[PDB]
Amino acid sequence: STGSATTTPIDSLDDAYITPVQIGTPAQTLNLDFDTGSSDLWVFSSETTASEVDGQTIYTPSKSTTAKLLSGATWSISYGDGSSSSGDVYTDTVSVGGLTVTGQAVESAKKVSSSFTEDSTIDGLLGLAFSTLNTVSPTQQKTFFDNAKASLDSPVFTADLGYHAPGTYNFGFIDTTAYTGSITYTAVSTKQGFWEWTSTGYAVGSGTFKSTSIDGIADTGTTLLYLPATVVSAYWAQVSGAKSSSSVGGYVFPCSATLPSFTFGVGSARIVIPGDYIDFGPISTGSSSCFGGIQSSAGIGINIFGDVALKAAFVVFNGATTPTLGFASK
User: Fold this and answer.
1) How would you classify the pairing of strands 41-43 and 294-296?
2) Per the residue annotation, which of 14, 33, 35, 279 is the catalytic one?
3) 35 catalytic, yes or no?
4) Is the distance from CB of 305 to CB of 277 less than 8 angstroms?
5) 3-state secondary structure of 123
6) With 0-12 CB in 10 A as exposed, 13-18 as middle and 19+ as buried, what is 314?
7) What's the rounded Cα separation, in Å, for the pair 219 and 223?
8) Which residue segments constitute the domains of the chain, with CATH numbers given?
């Protein structure tokens, strides 16, 4: 089997991407944030505290003839940005882009933190990291991809995120018309539960490529590119007036600037992030200070190849027995 679904930016900055997902019978379509940095499929629901729902579409398990409570199961998750959610668990039929999984754990939120409530466009998350990170207790549950894998034509999914435009998540096949040149694959470590890999270096603008190993994760659920302070300083030093602001929370730059590109290495290959992808706009409405799309990871503990980086590539998440990542230009 295969599936193919369009993913759409939630706003004009590409802060996140939503993908429609069919849950239950008859189908309830919710728009979920596909997140290769986590491993829970959770939704706003008829069980969510009413004051914490503000415009989201909810899953109502009592209206689904295929829903079943997973007795005793609870979940609770905290994300790197400080947001969180928790609740109980149903199994139900879940379909993405024509690919159907029966018996998928659908984690129904009883509580969500304010950042979720305040984002009316995201009805939940669909985790695509390794199932060892799933938070369901006392019996850990599998991701949608793990449940689908055996049925797929090939045990892969691909992320093709757009710049200020829709893109595609495909399951079970590699669309050879969706990228240019060849795909370069690179080894993955699953030791932390992430799609963790080692970039071979970077260049700033037209500068020389610096060969250096940068371990990090491919995370579609993180907006920006978080890299070591040395690398980030080298980038922003090429932008007149750019500076790191503790009060704002990262590097800012004059909105009048033209940003240089940023290149990252994948083996001997190179992925070029255009400068315009690194502009996240005014820090507040009407400001002439703009927020940078490349930020330091020094306070995170891990480097993160988020959407800024991934949307410059066609990315293969290869879930074979020995997982790998593939990157192509597009």
Assistant:
1) unpaired
2) 35
3) yes
4) no
5) coil
6) buried
7) 9
8) 5-174 (2.40.70.10), 175-330 (2.40.70.10)
